[PDB]
Design a protein around this motif. Structure first.
Motif, PDB file in Angstrom:
ATOM      1  N   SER A 155     -42.212  -8.073  86.567  1.00 18.03           N
ATOM      2  CA  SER A 155     -42.355  -6.947  85.237  1.00 18.03           C
ATOM      3  C   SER A 155     -42.700  -7.966  84.045  1.00 18.03           C
ATOM      4  O   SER A 155     -42.243  -9.148  83.769  1.00 18.03           O
ATOM      5  CB  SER A 155     -41.279  -6.286  85.124  1.00 18.03           C
ATOM      6  OG  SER A 155     -39.940  -7.273  84.695  1.00 18.03           O
ATOM      7  N   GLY A 200     -38.940   3.773  85.597  1.00 20.68           N
ATOM      8  CA  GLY A 200     -37.738   4.497  85.248  1.00 20.68           C
ATOM      9  C   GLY A 200     -37.340   5.504  86.218  1.00 20.68           C
ATOM     10  O   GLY A 200     -36.212   5.634  86.882  1.00 20.68           O
ATOM     11  N   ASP A 231     -43.767   4.656  88.384  1.00 19.66           N
ATOM     12  CA  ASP A 231     -42.977   4.750  87.079  1.00 19.66           C
ATOM     13  C   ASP A 231     -41.753   3.986  87.566  1.00 19.66           C
ATOM     14  O   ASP A 231     -40.836   4.230  88.321  1.00 19.66           O
ATOM     15  CB  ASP A 231     -42.857   6.150  86.621  1.00 19.66           C
ATOM     16  CG  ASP A 231     -41.982   6.285  85.403  1.00 19.66           C
ATOM     17  OD1 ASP A 231     -41.009   5.480  85.161  1.00 19.66           O
ATOM     18  OD2 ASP A 231     -42.423   6.914  84.513  1.00 19.66           O
ATOM     19  N   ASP A 287     -44.534  -2.476  80.267  1.00 25.71           N
ATOM     20  CA  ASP A 287     -43.217  -2.790  80.901  1.00 25.71           C
ATOM     21  C   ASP A 287     -42.769  -1.443  81.855  1.00 25.71           C
ATOM     22  O   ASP A 287     -41.543  -1.440  82.382  1.00 25.71           O
ATOM     23  CB  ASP A 287     -42.255  -2.934  79.950  1.00 25.71           C
ATOM     24  CG  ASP A 287     -42.186  -4.223  79.761  1.00 25.71           C
ATOM     25  OD1 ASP A 287     -42.135  -5.002  80.745  1.00 25.71           O
ATOM     26  OD2 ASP A 287     -42.163  -4.901  78.625  1.00 25.71           O
ATOM     27  N   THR A 288     -43.440  -0.142  81.593  1.00 18.87           N
ATOM     28  CA  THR A 288     -42.982   1.061  82.276  1.00 18.87           C
ATOM     29  C   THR A 288     -43.550   1.591  83.527  1.00 18.87           C
ATOM     30  O   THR A 288     -43.021   1.963  84.453  1.00 18.87           O
ATOM     31  CB  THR A 288     -43.007   2.109  81.293  1.00 18.87           C
ATOM     32  OG1 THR A 288     -44.452   2.335  80.876  1.00 18.87           O
ATOM     33  CG2 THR A 288     -42.324   1.857  80.216  1.00 18.87           C
ATOM     34  N   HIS A 289     -44.882   0.898  84.100  1.00 19.15           N
ATOM     35  CA  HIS A 289     -45.195   1.119  85.205  1.00 19.15           C
ATOM     36  C   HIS A 289     -45.942   0.047  86.058  1.00 19.15           C
ATOM     37  O   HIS A 289     -45.846  -1.268  85.442  1.00 19.15           O
ATOM     38  CB  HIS A 289     -46.617   1.939  85.154  1.00 19.15           C
ATOM     39  CG  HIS A 289     -46.409   3.373  84.500  1.00 19.15           C
ATOM     40  ND1 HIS A 289     -46.114   3.427  83.222  1.00 19.15           N
ATOM     41  CD2 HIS A 289     -45.951   4.644  84.929  1.00 19.15           C
ATOM     42  CE1 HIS A 289     -46.000   4.768  82.527  1.00 19.15           C
ATOM     43  NE2 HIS A 289     -45.871   5.672  83.880  1.00 19.15           N
TER      44      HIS A 289
END
Lengths: 53, 393, 305, 27, 149
Positions: C199, C262, C260, C244-246
């Motif tokens: 990440s 999260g 995703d 940073d989210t996918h």
């Protein structure tokens, strides 16, 4: 297990209502063609060779 | 039914709708709709396995076990998912529990059997299949009889220098396939088993005819395609074999199966598709580089292509330079395999034997780099003559 | 910028055979973005990303056994490539000329990755070691040994502290780049790990295996962060989004899946590729993904922000 | 003379067991 | 041998453009292994076939199992073992055209063999590797059998 074994009859109930046609025996069977007559005709030739005739 | 049709989206929709409606109909007979909800949950879990929504597949199997823990199919699917993870340990743990629940369950014994057969544990694997036929509930299981036949056949794939051990197994396998085919005329695997033993016995002429006759009924047994393709290679009709391997890879494997890719490489070598043979083995090494047999085959194809380039002086400079480094790489690979090769997969004399031929050809290859430069210059003279003659006009 | 996932650029018949790798880099000198591709036909092609499209600028010849992996420097106008001959070649993006050829040996170059500062180039090996080559020096400077089997995958953490490698025995290794010490050895997968990616915040490590499952591990504590499921075949490549989210994943099933972090659910699956997608990479800001495969085509997807 | 070396592939005439049919159950 | 070609085909469409003749109809078939395309016109009166029908097609140069290359005459008196004996439907005719993706710069990858069964047309469109026994203006037999499944 004393509490689980009481539901084997319930699992049998589920399985008694459930139906699947392809099983370990039927998975081995052809859709419609019969192989016996031809392969046994081939074995007629092979059997003589296995016996050394 | 949509699942049986491959309609994964419709199957998902209908099973979900069935569960949501089942909560409304369970108001009449909770026990009955709970049983129905088990069937719907299992069907949806089996679909999620096919749809790869493994957390929902796992949860649905666990939900069935939370509510109906004797449902053997949940343990077997949990184990099969572990098998798909390649975790034979976890797979065996789930199948063993299935046997601890029902010691006479043939699929649980068979699933562990598949683990043993994949691990080459022919004896332990055989134990699983022998235990099934003695019990009255499974005393007529053709799958177990055929499994013993397959055990003998699988031992036939391993090289015993004393042919009688293999031959004793050959007769064990053939007696099984002969009787099973007599009892069940639609038995696909008994017929193929007879063909397989005849092929091991060297009777490819009849074996090919048998594999073809089995193939007429179904297009979904790869071994029938593979057995036919192998005989096509043995009968030197390489184009047909290549075509079978190419389409087999596209139809049955979601990935490049190295076994089929290797069979293809063997056919491609003989088929004259040396370019594709090279590319296929380079793809194979890219897929399984620690498999030293494939690494050897890559080195062999580099050697065979270079042999052609190096024999004829008409071969150009880029070809010769590629052949020199490719042949150096091949010799380097055989030398590397002599130090890091996996001794259990190939004959140690083979790598040492080919290494020598590569070194010999590399020695002869250095001359061609100098030779190739002149051939490029030879055309320039005719072009210069053409230019002045064009000025003449 | 599309508010939904879709193909943004398509280059058909780019190579004579399967394209095994693609990389997206940002040239800080010109503030211009560049895409480089490697294929079995030995050619390294340089495509420059402009006005949301790729212009073919250079075709780089030099390899002899196909190009296994390519990456692009985020700081220098240089692209890197590896081949099955285990040789590393560095290419000039300004002139389209070969900079250097490194003869590492029959097994010292495989998957390739640039450091976030792009001063170093890491590559996996058959002997279970990760070699790091200096872009300017062109020599094997140091080597990280996992003592396991063949290292099929490697990836640098965007913070430049960790270099992850995935081996054919399913073991995942995390190395401290500054000291070259093996930080963490993870159970990883029970099957070979063909790809992994960190990440941008470097807290999570994504790993791809033949099992079709994707796993998330915490880079600092080596604890299992999560399990992802969805590919129908071998997962060939994975790359994290700079937002940073996918993160993106590629597979032999001919599909590319974007996840995703999260919700740990796949937002979209791409089927524009006709065959196995050997490589996937995000651009320098994560708004776009580049993909290449066995279909010999180079594709770029637009991603929602 | 050394008999001509073919591509190294262990010859397997197979009769592989089919995957166990766990098809979805009708009610 | 004399087997110029062989694969399993399935009927995907009957005279989609409409039935122009009564006892004959177009079959737009495709194979399973070699991925061959096939347009075949059959006497639908004597050998009615329906859509989705699977048939084994084996284009051979001759009817004799020995591949001894027959002469193209009809002879009701024929004592030799013949492949048609174990085949259901057989047509016979000349190849009247072969067509591929040939160019002034390179040869074709695909071959299209056009055959006229005495008026009944056929087109077996394939690759430049399977259509090797094929030569324009040559006698050939279709030797086909529907698979009874």
């Amino acid at each position: 297990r004393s509490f689980v074994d009481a539901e084997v009859d319930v699992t049998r109930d589920i399985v008694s209502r459930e139906r699947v046609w392809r099983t370990r025996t039927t998975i081995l069977q052809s859709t419609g063609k019969n192989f016996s007559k031809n392969i046994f005709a081939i074995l007629q030739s092979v059997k003589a060779r296995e016996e050394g005739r | 039914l949509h699942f049986r049709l491959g309609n994964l989206g419709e199957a998902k929709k209908y099973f979900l709708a069935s569960l949501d409606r089942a909560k409304a109909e369970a108001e009449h007979d909770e026990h009955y709709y709970n049983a129905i909800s088990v069937t719907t949950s299992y069907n949806l879990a089996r679909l999620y396995e096919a749809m790869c929504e493994f957390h929902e597949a796992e949860k649905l199997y666990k939900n069935i076990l939370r509510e109906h823990p004797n449902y053997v199919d949940c343990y077997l699917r949990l184990g099969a998912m572990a098998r798909d993870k390649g975790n034979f340990y976890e797979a065996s743990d789930w199948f063993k529990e299935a046997l601890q629940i029902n010691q006479d369950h043939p699929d649980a014994w068979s699933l562990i059997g598949n683990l043993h057969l994949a691990k080459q544990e022919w004896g332990p694997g055989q134990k699983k299949f022998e235990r099934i036929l003695k019990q009255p509930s499974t005393q007529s299981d053709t799958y177990s009889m055929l499994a013993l036949g397959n055990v003998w056949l699988q031992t036939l794939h391993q090289p015993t220098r004393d042919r009688e051990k293999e031959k004793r197994h050959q007769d064990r396998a053939l007696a099984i396939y002969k009787q099973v085919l007599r009892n069940d005329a639609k038995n696909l695997y008994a017929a193929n088993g007879i063909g397989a033993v005849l092929a091991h016995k060297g009777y490819f002429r009849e074996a090919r005819d048998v594999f073809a006759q089995v193939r007429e009924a179904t297009a979904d047994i790869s071994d029938v395609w593979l057995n036919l393709a192998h005989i096509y290679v043995e009968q030197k009709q390489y184009i047909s074999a290549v075509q079978m391997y190419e389409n087999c890879l596209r139809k049955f494997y979601k990935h490049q199966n190295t076994e089929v890719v290797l069979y293809l490489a063997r056919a491609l070598f003989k088929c004259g598709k040396l370019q594709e043979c090279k590319q296929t083995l380079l793809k194979a090494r890219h897929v399984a580089p620690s498999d030293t047999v494939l690494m050897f085959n890559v080195a062999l194809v580099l050697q065979r292509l270079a042999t052609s380039v190096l024999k004829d002086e008409k071969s150009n400079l880029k070809e010769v330079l590629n052949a020199v480094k490719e042949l150096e790489l091949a010799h380097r690979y055989f030398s590397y395999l002599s130090k890091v090769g996996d001794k259990m997969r190939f004959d140690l004399a083979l790598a040492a034997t080919e290494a020598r031929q590569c070194s010999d050809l590399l020695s002869q290859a250095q001359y061609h780099v100098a030779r190739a430069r002149k051939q490029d210059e030879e055309e320039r003279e005719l072009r210069a003559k053409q230019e002045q003659e064009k000025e003449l006009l | 910028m599309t508010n939904q996932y879709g193909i943004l650029f398509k280059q058909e018949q780019a190579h004579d055979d399967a394209i095994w790798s693609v990389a997206w880099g940002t040239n800080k000198k010109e503030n211009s973005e560049t895409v480089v591709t490697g294929s079995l036909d030995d050619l390294v092609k340089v495509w420059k990303w402009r006005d949301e499209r790729l212009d073919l600028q250079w075709s780089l010849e030099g390899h002899q056994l196909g190009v296994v992996s390519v990456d692009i420097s985020h700081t220098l106008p240089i692209a890197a490539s590896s081949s099955l001959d285990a040789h590393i070649r560095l290419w000039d993006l300004e002139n389209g000329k070969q900079i250097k050829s490194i003869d590492a040996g029959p097994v010292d170059a495989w998957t390739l990755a640039f450091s976030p500062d792009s001063q170093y180039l890491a590559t996996g090996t058959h002997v279970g070691k990760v070699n790091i080559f200096g872009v300017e020096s062109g020599k094997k400077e140091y080597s990280l040994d996992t003592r396991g089997k063949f290292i099929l995958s490697i990836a640098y953490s965007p913070d430049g502290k960790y270099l992850a490698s995935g081996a054919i025995d399913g073991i995942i290794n995390i190395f401290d780049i500054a000291t070259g010490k093996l930080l963490h050895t993870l159970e990883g997968h029970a099957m070979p790990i063909r790809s992994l990616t960190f990440s941008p915040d470097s807290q999570l490590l994504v790993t791809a295996s033949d099992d079709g499952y994707i796993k998330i591990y915490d880079v600092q504590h080596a604890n299992l962060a999560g399990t992802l499921s969805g590919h129908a075949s071998w997962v060939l490549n994975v790359a994290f989004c700079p937002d940073d989210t996918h993160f993106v994943s590629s597979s032999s099933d001919k599909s590319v899946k974007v996840w995703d972090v999260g919700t740990r659910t796949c937002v979209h699956t791409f089927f524009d590729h006709q065959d196995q997608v050997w490589g996937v990479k995000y651009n320098g800001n994560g708004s776009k993904i580049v993909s290449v495969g066995d279909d010999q085509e180079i594709h770029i997807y637009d991603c929602p922000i | 003379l050394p008999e001509r070396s073919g591509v190294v592939c262990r010859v397997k005439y197979c009769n592989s067991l089919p995957d166990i049919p766990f098809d979805p159950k009708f009610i | 041998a004399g087997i110029l070609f062989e694969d399993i085909f399935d009927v995907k469409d009957i005279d989609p453009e409409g039935k122009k003749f009564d006892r004959v109809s177009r079959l737009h078939c495709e194979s399973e292994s070699f991925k061959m395309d096939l347009i075949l016109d059959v006497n639908i009166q004597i050998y009615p076939v329906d859509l989705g029908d699977k048939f084994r097609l084996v284009i051979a140069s001759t009817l004799y199992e020995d591949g001894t290359l027959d002469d193209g005459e009809y002879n009701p008196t024929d004592d030799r073992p013949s492949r048609a004996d174990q085949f259901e439907y057989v047509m016979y005719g000349k190849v009247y055209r072969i067509e591929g993706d040939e160019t002034s710069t390179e040869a074709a990858t695909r071959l299209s063999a056009y055959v006229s069964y005495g008026g009944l047309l056929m087109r077996l469109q394939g690759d430049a590797n399977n259509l090797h026994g094929f030569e324009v203006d040559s006698r050939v037999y279709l030797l086909m059998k529907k698979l009874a499944f």
